[PDB]
Amino acid sequence: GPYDIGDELGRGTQGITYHAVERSSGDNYAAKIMYGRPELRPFMLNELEMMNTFNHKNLIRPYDAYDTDRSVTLIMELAAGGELVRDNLLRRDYYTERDIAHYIRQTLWGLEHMHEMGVGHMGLTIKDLLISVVGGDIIKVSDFGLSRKINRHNLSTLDYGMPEFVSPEVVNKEGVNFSHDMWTVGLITYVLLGGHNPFLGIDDRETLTKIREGRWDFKDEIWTHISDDGRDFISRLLLYSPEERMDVKTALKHPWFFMLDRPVYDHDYQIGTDRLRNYYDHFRDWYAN
């Protein structure tokens, strides 16, 4: 057998991802092993097909696949720096708004590659942003189990997802467009900068009712230290009406990213990691259960 399966690296709704070594080379890969429920097989096959459709620096690449009667294993590119939040931001005492803009721009470049070929990601959460090398700053977007071709003139419902990162149109059982991904980018950006999810309820049902209602604000003190452009970027994505949201190419033109064209000086505001760490502990526990 070509792969030596080692320690658990992450887990999601379809299975657990492990470190894998290709024996014949010594090269390191990620091995996603499906939970033993046969209804997950279509999602594994969809992820394999989608990974083989993309070819972009900011999207995880496929490598190999095999199966038993019950379960599918996918061997894929290893993001050796781990998850952005768990393994990079939360290993620091502070990060900056400029750091986050750098990560989100790359996330948008990955999404843009998908949207250009008519595919929506459909399931983006904070755990799906990865870093390619230890200590690095290159983003890899992952988890294409829910990704699909979107016909903008013949929309369909999206019946699955993590409740803290779905959009109002998902909760309301309406057709889902490319603008759903853009809502989730605004939500991820809000979480990365302010360290909390503005729709979090006491349980999943209440979270969903808060998303259905669609109201949120910048009340926490941290937001007074985020730039006008950063708040404007979020506010042009977290809009109840899907057609009002920025599409991916408009988002890439937003003035928020102009700061990445200048250098990093000694005056960037330093954001502490405590809030994000508290939200991440909650988020991670959702996948333990």
Residue numbers in the entry: -1 to 0, 3186 to 3472
Q: What's the publication's text?
A:
Of the variants tested, only the protein construct encompassing the kinase domain followed by 40 C-terminal residues (dmUNC89/Obsc residues 3186–3480) yielded a soluble and stable protein product viable for structural analysis. The atomic structure of dmObsc-PK1 was then elucidated to 1.75 Å resolution using X-ray crystallography. The structure revealed the kinase domain followed by a short CRD tail, limited to the first regulatory helix, αR1 (nomenclature as in 18), with the remaining 8 terminal residues being poorly ordered in electron density maps. Helix αR1 is amphipathic and its packing against the kinase is mediated by a cluster of aromatic residues that includes the conserved tryptophan W3469 at the helix C-terminus. The overall structure of dmObsc-PK1 resembles that of other CAM-kinases, e.g. DAPK, which also displays a CRD tail that is disordered beyond helix αR1. However, this disinhibited state of dmObsc-PK1 -where ATP and substrate binding sites are exposed- contrasts markedly with structures of nearest homologues, the sarcomeric titin-like kinases. In dmObsc-PK1, both the catalytic (C)-spine (residues I3199, A3213, L3267, L3312, L3313, I3314, I3371, L3375) and the regulatory (R-)spine (residues M3234, P3245, H3304, F3327) are pre-formed in the absence of ATP binding. Finally, in dmObsc-PK1, the activation loop is in an open state so that access to the active site is unrestricted. In summary, these features indicate that dmObsc-PK1 adopts an overall conformation similar to that of canonical kinases in the active state. More globally, nucleotide binding does not induce either global or local conformational changes in dmObsc-PK1, with apo and ADP-complexed crystal structures being equivalent (RMSDCα = 0.18Å).
